[PDB]
Design a protein around this nucleic acid. Structure first.
Ligand SMILES: Nc1ncnc2c1ncn2[C@@H]1O[C@H](COP(=O)(O)OP(=O)(O)O)[C@@H](O)[C@H]1O
Lengths: 96, 443, 97, 85, 109, 96, 80, 109, 96
DNA sequence: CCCTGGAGAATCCCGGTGCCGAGGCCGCTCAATTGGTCGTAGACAGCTCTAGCACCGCTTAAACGCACGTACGCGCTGTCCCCCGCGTTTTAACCGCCAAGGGGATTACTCCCTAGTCTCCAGGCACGTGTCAGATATATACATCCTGTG
DNA sequence: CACAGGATGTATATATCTGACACGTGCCTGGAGACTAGGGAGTAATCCCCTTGGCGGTTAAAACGCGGGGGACAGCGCGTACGTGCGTTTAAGCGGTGCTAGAGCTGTCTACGACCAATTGAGCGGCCTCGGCACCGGGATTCTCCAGG
């Protein structure tokens, strides 16, 4: 068998089933979504790293990610992403 | 060893203060000391300087560049005095744009046929580069509190000059503390007063000030002009004023200067955006109630109408001045507005119409620090201060703008004060400064 | 009777003069007030350094000069000499703004 | 009741100033409608840059905007500005 | 004994791998140290973006009588929504085609 | 007989090709061109199929965007025909 | 090999232009667009071959092409 | 004893801080390990680029008959050279001016 | 005293005196040169890091720097810089 | 000269097919769980020095409004060549199949390279200093454009 | 239609002033010499995947030519909006009160959270298999477009 490879395919499929209950996706579109997730990850992580470098701080935190999404995502997308991230952090800090 | 006016003067007999000041200046010069003549209005500082220059010219020959630093508003007056008292003394003035200034300097300054030069502060800061090669023998400055502080371009350039003698003309040598007095003393004697300065104070201050200062106060010089009458009025503010005050205290409105937000906030709330009512914007009974001090002023206004006349209002804010103007307009009452935004021609027209023998002019709203040493109001009766500035000397200038030798009866001052505010501390500082200055200089 | 230049000599002289100089062209006080008004909406109670306004002025000058160059190229393409909001909009559209 | 506002700050970018910028760009004849459009374009550009700079200043827990913040914002936009850091 | 393990995605109610995101963050040389909440925040952001794109693409695919989401549907959803167009302004989507756009001047009189 | 007017067939073609989503340049000629270009940089280069396909996709997208901007320039010049001057103006405004 | 640039024939360019949204095509467009295609391909192939040389491989890959396109700012979703 | 200390810059015959460049590479979070020839190579490349730019700027200053370089001279050097213009095709140089460029149609005729 | 900051001013001065025996430089131009060196360093280092990550390694080496130089610089400058950097590494490893 | 008819395309609806997505099972590696620890960030006090806000001069340059006239943008005509649409023939792409080998991809070894420490000291930064290069002014001399007139 | 004169703008020198760049010294911290241990990478070797080359047939596509309409382009005329000058008018720019508290930066100290390490087991990735979806083909409804009256 070939050496194992990573993918966001299962998580994309879970989100797809959550949103549209009975709609499937093809391999090309799954590859496109994988690349899109990788690209967004790269851009947000790079912005957070540059922020940490500028502020002379050696740690990446939720503040850094919030500032990065505000810088990168335009407008209402940024607002909704910030709200969703704050909710997730609150739930994680509470439940754990 | 001069108790009388010399023969070279024309149109002058002197009232002995000129001869005493001339003798004091001559003694200081012979000792090799430059001092401060601190006479404050009505005692002829210009006349003293004219007498000194005429003495130097006529007696033992000491001709040279004579510098007269005066405010630009006083150039014509100084020229008139120079040409009227001592015509033998030769004086010129350097004013105008670049072309006129270059023409005048190239025609007169470089040949150096003149005897006295009169220049303003801005002309001096512009033409420092040409005013350096010549040797300076006597430097005369009027209103020395312009260079009262260390550092600034004018102070630096005036300390740059090489002058054999120096002379300062001012009325208020001490304004806030000992620092400006020491700055002037250092300008007089840089080596003597190199030190930065009841044993360490008061007594040493008097000992230092005695040989190098001589001021005669108009109160003990004129023996006329009945005194003032000050009234203190405490003011409670409207509830909307109090809630705005609380909001400013705790905290989308610009918030940069809490001190000067509470200031005007205790004066009138409509200066802020949104305090006024809606689109109507009709002047009716909400100008008054919304400001406590405005309530008291609006109550006193019919009193001033029914008794006396020539009331003066002093304020420190152009917005408050304009609001007061609009209120006096809504009350269908005559008013006259003077402020730094009013050009000189209209200033002169307004003052001439105001001093006109029989005028219906009732309100003369005069901003405290506008204009310089001019505007000779003598028929005024009531002086009203909406607010008081940091400088008791500036307040004194404001009150003596009406308090002049031409005034024959005592004049009244009404002060409005706001409680539970920083205005109390401001009034305390002003009063202690005035007391210190009186107990230091007046006696 | 008085001497006058033809319509376009003064324009070309100004073009050469301002293409030879290096200083800024807009006024510091109005630009600073504009920057403060713009930033007030995004966040109130903001303090601005002196170097920030100068840097903003430099960047805006470069951007506007490049935009005007592209606008003039488009207007010359349309066989004109006058520039117009149509040229500005086309330049922005092609550059991707 | 005596208030009179002065002007909007976009009008502070005057027609002669826009003309000087056009001369530096290399244009000869200008229509009359260019000025309003240029004011709008300048406003858009300034809004983007100032939003990025205010984001940086807010993140640094600072209440003062800095030349480095402006340079970082311009680099993010893709308008690298040499001469300030 | 040891308790049953719980994924950080389960603790945060997410659908994206918080542990995998944390591993990629630490292995990516982005910074020396990484906090606990940064992977959770980043996973939530990624999940929101993926959900938005999938919802728009699903609407596009349903409008054209399909059940499979294809690159044409993805490109339709991206280029018909202004904010996603701004986010992906410089991206080519393979076999996506172009939006219908015929200039009004070219149309017959 | 029958003869469509000069331009209606063009509009039908525009609609059809904007609706379609397949490639338009012949794959063997494109592959030969890619090999010829790669001849100069390196000798004896081998290619994967996906590499040639990705090159084709990028070339098609670039040319399509360039043609759109060229048509915008041609409309600006009060014309319907596009010309090399329009293409060059588009390239110059883009900054290449 | 040579002349293979002529293999990008006129009908293919016309199809691309039609997808772009143009109606009338001049006769000199074809040479200009062939030149544009050639310079674009030269840039991409230069970067891809440099990536492959660094990898010490003799096969150019889709990943290499995607990396070159990303370096030039023309990100290509859908190939890895 | 020990050996007399000599810098790695002078060791490689450079005029750039190989030690400082090495520290910046190690601290910049670029890779978990950095070699020994990489800082030398980077310093040499930076030295060559600086030499080229400064050479052109000094030539422009001497053409303009001056003895000090200013950002206007730097801009004139960066432009008028194709390779440097391509390298710095997105850089704004503060108070650097613009090249003289007047189109032929605007000239009188 | 105050804090300390780092800049390439002295090395820029050394190269300037080397390449033009008598030609000074002002403060603004030196700041621009400092920014230029910082930006070039950032680009080359980022490209080298991305190359190392793509090839699944962990060491930045002269091969990575050379490949980054070729990918960044345009042509004639690229070859001159590569040649002189190879010379510098050869001198460093020759007798040291 | 809008209205009408022929044709061409586009469209919609079934019917049979091929395959790709979707589900299910196996192994394993990466994530979860505890436990110990060490820097890194938080928090707080002190300095200080720059940025605010409401007036008050004073000066000078840049705006602002204005009238006139003149190129210039804009619309209309007319020619004419070029591009388009269609039928035909030739060409080569495209699609299956087959064979061979290069080269990518993985694994195991082993060593040489780099990280981490510790002294030791010198190169670099900050602070204070002084001469000169550059800006400016003023007065010539030169070049350019515009208008009138033979 | 061309030349010559005149007005204006500009290039060019010399003399002054000034504030910054170039330079020196002292202190310090981070770079350099000398050493060690561990593990990442260079090398060798092997498997099998994927690329390349080849052939044959088919048919879609490209090339070629021909006839004709429409659109580019030159030219002409108009009437208007912009550039060039001028006299007023703000307002920027600079320099002063007059106060300020406020925010940024340095030093110190301490707690807590991120890292490292060992262990363990669900979570995924890869391999199969099978059925619903998309596709291809055929057959029968509109919808547009172009002459022609
Ligand atoms: N020559 C004079 N002798 C006496 N008093 C004078 C003289 N000139 C003016 N005053 C009074 O002094 C007041 C202000 O004088 P001021 O202008 O200060 O004199 P000077 O110009 O000599 O300094 C006026 O109100 C006037 O009444």
């Amino acid at each position: 068998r070939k050496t194992r490879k990573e993918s966001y395919a299962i998580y994309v499929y879970k989100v797809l089933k959550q949103v549209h209950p009975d709609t499937g996706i093809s391999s090309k579109a799954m590859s496109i979504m994988n690349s899109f997730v990788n690209d967004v990850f790269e851009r947000i992580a790079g912005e957070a790293s540059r922020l940490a470098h500028y502020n002379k701080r050696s740690t990446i935190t939720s503040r850094e990610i919030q500032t990065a999404v505000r810088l990168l995502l335009p407008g209402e997308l940024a607002k909704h992403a910030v709200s969703e991230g704050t909710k997730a952090v609150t739930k994680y800090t509470s439940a754990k | 060893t001069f108790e009388d006016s010399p023969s070279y003067v024309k149109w002058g007999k002197l009232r002995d203060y000129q001869v005493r000041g001339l003798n004091w200046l001559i003694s200081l010069y012979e000792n090799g000391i430059n001092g401060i003549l601190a006479d404050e209005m009505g005692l002829g500082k210009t006349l003293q300087t004219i007498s000194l220059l005429g003495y130097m010219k006529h007696y033992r020959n000491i001709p040279g560049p004579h510098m007269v630093l005066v405010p630009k508003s006083t150039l014509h007056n100084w020229m008139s005095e120079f040409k009227r008292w001592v015509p033998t003394l030769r004086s010129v003035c350097l004013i105008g744009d670049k072309e006129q200034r270059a023409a005048f300097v190239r025609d007169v300054l470089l040949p150096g046929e003149w005897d006295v030069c009169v220049t303003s502060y801005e002309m001096l800061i512009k033409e420092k580069s040409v005013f350096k090669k010549f040797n300076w023998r006597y430097l005369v400055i009027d209103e020395a509190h312009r260079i009262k502080n260390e550092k600034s371009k004018l102070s630096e350039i005036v300390r740059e000059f090489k002058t054999t003698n120096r002379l300062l003309l001012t009325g208020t040598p001490l304004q806030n503390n000992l620092h400006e007095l020491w700055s002037l003393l250092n300008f007089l004697l840089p080596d003597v007063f190199n030190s930065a300065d009841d044993q360490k104070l008061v007594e040493r201050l008097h000992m230092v000030l005695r040989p190098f200062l001589l001021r005669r106060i108009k109160a003990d010089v004129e023996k006329s002009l009945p005194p003032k009458k000050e009234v203190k009025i405490y003011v409670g503010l409207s509830k909307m004023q109090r809630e705005w005050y609380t909001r400013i205290l705790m905290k989308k409105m610009r918030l940069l200067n809490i001190l000067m937000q509470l200031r005007k906030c205790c004066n009138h709330p409509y200066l802020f955006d949104g305090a006024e009512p809606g689109p109507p914007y009709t002047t009716d009974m909400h100008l008054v109630t919304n400001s406590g001090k405005m309530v008291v002023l609006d109550k006193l206004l019919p009193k001033l109408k029914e008794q006396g006349s020539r009331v003066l209002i002093f304020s420190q804010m152009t917005r408050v001045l304009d609001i007061l103007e609009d209120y006096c307009m809504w009350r269908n009452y005559e008013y006259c507005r003077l402020d730094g935004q009013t050009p000189h021609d209209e200033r002169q027209d307004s003052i001439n119409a105001y001093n006109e023998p029989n005028s219906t002019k009732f309100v003369f709203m005069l901003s405290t620090r506008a204009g310089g040493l001019g505007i000779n109001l003598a028929t005024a009766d009531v002086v009203i201060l909406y607010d008081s500035d940091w400088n008791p000397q500036v307040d004194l200038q404001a009150m003596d703008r009406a308090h002049r030798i031409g005034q024959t009866k005592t004049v009244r001052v009404f002060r409005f004060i706001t409680d539970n505010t920083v205005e109390e501390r401001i009034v305390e500082r002003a009063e202690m400064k005035l007391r210190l200055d009186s107990i230091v200089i007046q006696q | 009777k008085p001497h006058r230049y033809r319509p376009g000599t003064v324009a070309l002289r100004e073009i050469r003069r301002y293409q030879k100089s290096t200083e800024l062209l807009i006024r510091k006080l109005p630009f600073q007030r504009l920057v403060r008004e713009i930033a007030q909406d995004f966040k109130t109670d903001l303090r601005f350094q002196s170097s920030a306004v100068m840097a903003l002025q430099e960047a805006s000058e470069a951007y506007l000069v490049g935009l005007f160059e592209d606008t003039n190229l488009c207007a010359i393409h349309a066989k004109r000499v006058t520039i117009m909001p149509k040229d500005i909009q086309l330049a922005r559209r092609i550059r991707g703004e | 009741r005596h208030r009179k506002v002065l002007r909007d700050n976009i009008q502070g970018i005057t027609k002669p100033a826009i003309r000087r910028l056009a001369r530096r760009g290399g244009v000869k004849r200008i229509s009359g409608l260019i000025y309003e459009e240029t004011r709008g374009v300048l406003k858009v550009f300034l809004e983007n840059v100032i939003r990025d700079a205010v984001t940086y200043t807010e993140h640094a827990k600072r209440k003062t905007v800095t030349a480095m913040d402006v340079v970082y914002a311009l680099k993010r936009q893709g308008r690298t500005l040499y001469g300030f850091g | 004994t040891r308790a049953k393990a719980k994924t950080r995605s389960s603790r945060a109610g997410l659908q994206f791998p918080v542990g995998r995101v944390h591993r990629l963050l630490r292995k990516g040389n982005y910074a020396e140290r990484v906090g606990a909440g940064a992977p959770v925040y980043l996973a939530a952001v990624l999940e929101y973006l993926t959900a938005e794109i999938l919802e728009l693409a699903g609407n596009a695919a349903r409008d054209n009588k399909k059940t499979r989401i294809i690159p044409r549907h993805l490109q339709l959803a991206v280029r018909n929504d202004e904010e996603l167009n701004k986010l992906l302004g410089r991206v080519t989507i393979a076999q996506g085609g172009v939006l219908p756009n015929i200039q009004s001047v070219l149309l017959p009189k």
